[PDB]
Write a protein that binds this DNA or RNA. Structure first.
Ligand SMILES: Nc1ncnc2c1ncn2[C@@H]1O[C@H](COP(=O)(O)OP(=O)(O)OP(=O)(O)O)[C@@H](O)[C@H]1O
Ligand SMILES: [Mg+2]
Lengths: 198, 983, 202
RNA sequence: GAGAAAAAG
DNA sequence: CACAATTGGGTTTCTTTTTCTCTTGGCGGT
DNA sequence: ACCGCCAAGAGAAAAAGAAACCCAATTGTG
């Protein structure tokens, strides 16, 4: 629990949620999937393009992105944010370090509403490397894509609605060479998070 | 509380100035208010009572005692001593002083005990004794007990009265040494010393003259401005002390105004282009103020003249013309024949120091003003401050700095300024040093010097010296005094040659750097931009490195140029083990090849019957070509290379060049020149030789392990047992690694081609020598790789073959020939481990008497286990090294020999080396004859097992610690016949 | 161009003619400070908050927004929000944790303070180059800003008028912030004044 | 205070 | 209240001294 | 001759390196 979740929340709130999303962003784009925690999941989409990577890091393009993602955002009872263990001690990989931290901070700011009004810190960060053990996908140094396991799930842990399953199968079959949809593995790690939610 | 500390510091330091009526006002103000009455009683009342006692005012102490009675706390015995002092220095009333004696006899205070317990001023103590003798001559305690003598078995022969003993005599007459003492006194009263640079004064031009003229005029201007600002701000604080507390007026008027204007101008001159932090300048300014106060208090107190008189009486012991009535040790003649008084002033606390530094820095900022820009037109008609405090970034933390204006930097760079400012401590002595009477007593004349060097804090190192038995520290202090009395001078011709190479570009392979002029100082592709950025970075780092070496070379050779044709004495201090280090840092024998080559003895023994041969041996001992052969072959080699020696001494730089290629080239040149001068003489024996002669150790720590529990194997491998041919363990280990590498090369590994037989003794010395200590393979690979980094044969290094063969593969063979020593290592490691688990730091006593403690604490503070189980053997075996070194020093001094010792490398004249050798073997046999291991076990049991914390920590430590490894069938007495012990 | 050299966000001049409420804050790696001053001369408030639990070796976003929310709980609401961007660049290998700290706080605080961003569609928080806002004044030499402590002392006690309701507390806290090296609150008033001069009241 | 190094055990 | 056996993260034998800079470097047409 | 100024991207460059190692912490236990 504490090793898997750096923040802490009540166990009854963790077990029972009406609906959650997958706040998982890549370097190029973010993809969000609507998980209702009853193993029946509603909607998954992604951002079309990111304009912040062009030019220099500046607050305006960050805000212009985050307004668009939180505008396309469906309302959920709980929200899970990823947490990457990029080491500060490593001298290289500084731009992606700022990218991931600042994107995490503004997702943790705009999406997390009613923090001043309601005392509960609402969105929590998840240890990705410890969840990778629950994946049993590799040795642990690197994480492979989870497209094979969601392909084994459908096209039965996903359980899309009957009107949505055919369109989502068509969209998954249409998008296979983007090579930025690796976040699909994270789209089932919330299912792994339900191992904590029972 | 902190405010109580600041108030105590204020009322303490106001006695060291003369502002007593200013002291009374703030005491009265704090006693007036009940909220200010708290934290006022804490040991300041006897301080101000002593303040009124020293001055000619006996009436005010009645008000002081009434104030103490109003406080309600019991009067201190120091207050009674102050009352007896104010009864002194004045015409006695012939009454009620005995009533005062009866009153102080009441409530448990004793008249007899205040002479020994108050620790008052000794002149005031004599005045109190005069008042008592005016009252009654019944009591007079004699403090002149006979001088106590150490009763240790090892030091018994040194301090024995009987026997024919001869002492060294310095060359100079008494009056010349007194003039030298006068010169060093004048050089120490003004703490800075100005040194002429060895940088070439190049091209005096019109722009240079303009810069000098405007710099001198503006310098007079800012000196006047600084004096005016000091006057205004001191007047402001003197107004503040009337209506407040902690006001800095006695702290600022502690010195005279001239010394603080010179101090502020000097700290303005020392700032680089990028100004350092405000905290750093605050620390530096207040620490320099403290050292200045310690230097300049003794002028107005009167101790300088008394020190001069006592020095005049003492200096006859080292003078050629004068004769001491009975010969005795340098310290013991200082112990008798009068004794000087040391105040031993405790420094004021940290917030006072920091805040005084802050106001000094702010005064320097708001005072010192530069007119307009550097340009000749002055149309702006405005003066801007030269230094602005700047919010900056540093490296990890935002700390405010103090940045000078760039036009000041341009003007400062424009003028050459050949003057260099050195500290009084850093420059060597000009008179023979002050004897080490006590750990509180120092080697320097007017400035303190701590016995053991610490990094920061670490009070327990000096606390063990304070709580040590008084006669136990006597031998170490005598040895340090012996190391102080060495007489030095600089070579003329070696200094001339080094400076001649310094002025030109020179050769950097000798240790003399070059000027930075010879140092390196549209884009087609982004890869081209990356290559350009890489080569700018390489050029910048190389230029910074060469400038860094050049600055230290200039700062050493300038002091060497200053210190020609005079005689010098380097004082010596201690580390926490006991191993001795010279106090002057820039110019000492623990330096480089050049720095070692500059020094020679000021007093020269004749070569004697043996003579020149030993000098030649020393030459070969620094030639480095022949280290693994006996002495007769070294002398034959020195005979064969004689033509090169004559050619190198006649023409060092112009002609045929032989002193290159040696491991220590300039020392080889110095010994070369001295040998060639010694040969060109009518009598080689009657020649005066000033050259030091070296005696080094073969593998000293392994020898010391071999003695602590005798061995037949390994002890014979470290030349303890006598042998005609020297035996080095390092060469055997290197041969074993090389014959493993030959088979690995026949197998076909790629790393065997990149080692390629470049392994030597110097490659593996550090790692094989740290195998006997607790070594981790990272520590092995950081030392086996640095050596191959200095060698320039193979470019790309991965050194793990050498470590994986050296602590793993030959470690089977290392266990084979080193058996029993590793048992000692495991015993010491387990003892230190269980001590660390108990929670204590390891304390051990040397056989001579020096107590050693380890300053390894975690971040009141818990011990750190990792740097204490490891680093316990190379912290005790060095203590044994230092004990042997000091024993050799004392028994060298007793036979009329002059002795200066690099640790594990002793130095002596040409005639005297055989006597010093026999001294060395005798001390090695004497030190290990006493069983160090069993005494160490008993002391470790008594210190670390005498308390019942728990049954397990008592029982396991007792069972592991009562066991001592069994010594073998080898006699220590063979060491007196050992020829190649220290050679 | 010139206003674009000063201001990093692009706000057209008509709104900047009458802003009527400006808050200027200065980020610091150890301590935080802020002050409200309008387009008129009136100063509304001046406070600093100390004792962060942060820069203690561990970087966590939850305590980041806890600290930023604790700061914003005392902050008022104004039309435009003044920020002071550092002079540091990402290319500097040294001072990297400080730069990450500054970027993460500017992202968190710029992300907040705008309740109606989706409604108006216009940016609300603006940032300053520290070198340029010094360059309206004379404080640089060698392209480095000096303290401005003497300048803010001369301006406090016209270039700026402090209202007399809180000037006693301002002086009492100014004695303490002049004894100690606290440079962060000193730049806040200076950058506010240069905002009201160089882009406002032309 | 951290860094770039350098020389003695 | 009182433990508690197993699981990651800072450190790697030790002791002295010394110098220097805290990215600036490059471009620009008056 | 002197401030002016200025934009410092996102490139694969992965650089040393790993290999023990020990000493303290944590969800489980009585
Ligand atoms: N880096 C070090 N770590 C620990 N001890 C050291 C170190 N360098 C030197 N010593 C100590 O110095 C002494 C011997 O070292 P030194 O370099 O003088 O060798 P040596 O005996 O003179 O060898 P050789 O004459 O064969 O060159 C030992 O007491 C050893 O512990
Ligand atoms: Mg030796």
């Amino acid at each position: 629990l504490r090793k898997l979740l750096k923040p802490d929340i009540e166990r009854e709130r963790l077990k029972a949620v009406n609906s959650i999303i997958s706040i998982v962003f890549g370097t190029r784009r973010i993809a969000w999937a609507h998980l209702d925690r009853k193993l029946t999941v509603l909607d998954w989409q992604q951002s079309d393009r990111w304009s912040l990577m062009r030019g220099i890091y500046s607050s305006s393009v960050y805000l212009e992105e985050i307004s668009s993602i939180i505008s396309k955002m469906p309302k959920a009872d709980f929200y899970v944010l990823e947490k990457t263990g990029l080491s500060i001690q490593n001298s290289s990989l500084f731009p992606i370090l700022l990218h991931f931290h600042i994107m995490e901070a503004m997702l943790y700011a705009l999406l997390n509403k009613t923090f001043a009004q309601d005392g509960q810190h609402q969105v929590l960060s998840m240890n990705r490397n410890a969840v990778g053990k629950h994946f049993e996908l590799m040795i642990g140094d690197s994480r492979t894509s989870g497209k094979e396991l969601v392909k084994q799930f459908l096209f039965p842990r996903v359980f899309f609605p009957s009107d949505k399953i055919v369109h989502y199968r068509q969209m998954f079959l249409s998008t296979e060479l983007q090579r930025v949809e690796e976040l699909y593995d994270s789209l089932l790690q919330a299912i792994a998070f339900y191992e904590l939610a029972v | 509380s902190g405010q109580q500390q600041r108030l105590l510091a204020f009322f303490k330091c106001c006695l060291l100035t003369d502002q007593l009526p200013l002291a009374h006002h703030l005491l009265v103000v704090h006693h007036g208010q009940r909220q200010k009455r708290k934290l006022l009683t804490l040991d300041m009342y006897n301080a101000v009572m002593l303040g009124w006692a020293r001055q000619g005012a006996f009436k005010e102490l009645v008000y002081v005692l009434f104030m103490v009675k109003d406080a309600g706390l019991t009067p201190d015995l120091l207050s009674y001593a102050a009352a007896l002092q104010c009864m002194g220095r004045q015409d006695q009333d012939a009454g009620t002083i005995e009533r005062c004696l009866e009153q102080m006899s009441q409530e448990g205070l004793k008249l007899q005990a205040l002479f020994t317990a108050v620790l008052l001023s000794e002149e005031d103590r004599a005045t109190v004794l005069k008042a008592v003798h005016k009252v009654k001559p019944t009591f007079s305690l004699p403090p002149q007990l006979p001088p106590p003598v150490n009763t240790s078995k090892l030091l018994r022969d040194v301090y024995a009265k009987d026997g024919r003993v001869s002492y060294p005599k310095l060359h100079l007459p008494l009056k010349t040494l007194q003039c030298l003492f006068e010169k060093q006194l004048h050089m120490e009263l003004a703490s800075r010393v100005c040194v002429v640079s060895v940088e070439k004064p190049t091209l005096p031009s019109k722009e240079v003259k303009h810069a000098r003229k405007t710099l001198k005029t503006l310098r007079d201007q800012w000196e006047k401005a600084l004096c005016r600002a000091l006057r205004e701000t001191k007047n402001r604080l003197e107004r503040e002390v009337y209506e407040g507390r902690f006001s800095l007026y006695p702290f600022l008027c502690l010195l005279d105004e001239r010394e603080v204007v010179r101090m502020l101008l000097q700290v303005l001159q020392a700032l680089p282009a990028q100004g350092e932090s405000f905290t750093t300048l605050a620390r530096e300014l207040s620490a320099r103020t403290f050292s200045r106060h310690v230097v300049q208090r003794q002028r107005v107190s009167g101790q300088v003249q008394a020190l001069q008189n006592h020095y005049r009486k003492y200096l006859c012991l080292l003078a050629s013309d004068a004769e001491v009535p009975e010969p005795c040790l340098p310290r013991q003649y200082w112990e008798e024949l009068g004794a000087p008084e040391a105040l031993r002033e405790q420094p004021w606390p940290l917030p006072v120091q920091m805040e005084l530094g802050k106001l000094l820095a702010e005064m320097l900022v708001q005072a010192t003003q530069m007119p307009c820009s550097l340009d000749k037109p002055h149309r702006s008609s405005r003066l801007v401050p030269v230094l602005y405090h700047v919010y900056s970034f540093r490296n990890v933390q935002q700390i405010g700095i103090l940045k000078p204006h760039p036009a000041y930097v341009q003007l400062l760079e424009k003028a050459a300024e050949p003057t260099l400012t050195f500290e009084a401590v850093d420059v060597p002595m000009l008179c023979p040093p002050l004897p080490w009477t006590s750990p509180h007593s120092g080697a320097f004349l007017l400035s303190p010097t701590k016995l053991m060097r610490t990094v920061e804090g670490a009070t327990q190192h000096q606390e063990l010296l304070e709580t040590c038995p008084p006669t136990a520290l006597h031998g170490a202090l005598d040895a340090l005094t012996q190391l102080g009395n060495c007489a030095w001078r600089v070579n003329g011709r070696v200094l001339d040659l080094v400076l001649q190479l310094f002025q030109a570009k020179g050769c950097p392979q000798l240790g003399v750097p070059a000027p930075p002029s010879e140092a390196p100082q549209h884009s087609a592709a982004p890869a081209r931009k990356a290559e350009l950025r890489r080569e700018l970075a390489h050029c910048q780092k190389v230029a910074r490195e060469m400038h860094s070496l050049r600055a230290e070379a200039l700062y050493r050779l300038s002091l060497a140029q200053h210190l020609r044709d005079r005689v010098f004495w380097l004082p010596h201090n201690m580390d926490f083990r006991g191993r001795t280090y010279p106090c002057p840092p820039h110019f000492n024998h623990l330096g480089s090849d050049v720095a070692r080559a500059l020094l020679e003895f000021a007093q020269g023994r004749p070569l004697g019957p043996h003579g020149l041969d030993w000098l030649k041996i020393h030459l070969v001992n620094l030639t480095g070509l022949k280290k693994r052969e006996p002495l007769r072959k070294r002398l034959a080699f020195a005979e064969e290379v004689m033509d090169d020696i004559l050619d190198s001494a006649d023409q060092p730089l112009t002609g045929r060049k032989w002193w290159m290629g040696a491991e220590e080239p300039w020392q080889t040149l110095a010994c070369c020149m001295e040998v060639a001068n010694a040969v060109r003489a009518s009598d080689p024996a009657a020649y005066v030789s000033h050259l030091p002669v070296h005696q080094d150790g073969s593998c000293n720590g392994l020898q010391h392990y071999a003695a602590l529990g005798r061995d037949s194997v390994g002890a014979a491998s470290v030349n303890l047992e006598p042998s005609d041919v020297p035996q080095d363990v390092y060469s055997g280990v290197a041969a074993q690694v090389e014959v493993f590498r030959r088979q690995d090369a026949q197998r076909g590994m790629r790393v065997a081609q990149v080692l390629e037989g470049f392994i030597t003794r110097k490659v593996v010395k550090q790692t094989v020598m740290t195998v006997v200590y607790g070594v981790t393979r990272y520590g092995g690979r950081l030392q086996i790789e640095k050596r191959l980094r200095e060698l320039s044969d193979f470019p790309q290094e991965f050194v793990w073959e050498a470590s994986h063969y050296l602590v793993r593969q030959v470690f089977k063979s290392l266990q084979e020939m080193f058996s029993g020593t590793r048992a000692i290592q495991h015993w010491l490691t387990e003892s230190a481990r269980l001590i660390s688990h108990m929670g204590s730091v390891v304390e051990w006593v040397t056989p001579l008497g020096v107590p050693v403690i380890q300053p390894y604490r975690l971040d009141s503070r818990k011990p750190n286990t990792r740097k204490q189980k490891n680093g316990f053997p190379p912290n005790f075996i060095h203590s044994l090294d230092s004990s042997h070194m000091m024993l050799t020093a004392l028994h060298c001094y007793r036979k009329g020999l002059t002795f200066v010792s690099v640790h594990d490398c002793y130095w002596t004249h040409a005639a005297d080396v055989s006597v010093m050798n026999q001294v060395c073997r005798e001390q090695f046999v004497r030190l290990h004859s006493e069983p160090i291991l069993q005494d160490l076990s008993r002391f470790l049991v008594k210190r670390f097992c005498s308390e019942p914390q728990k049954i397990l920590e008592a029982s396991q430590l007792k069972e592991t610690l009562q066991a001592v490894p069994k010594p073998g069938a080898f006699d220590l007495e063979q060491v007196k016949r050992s020829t190649y012990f220290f050679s």
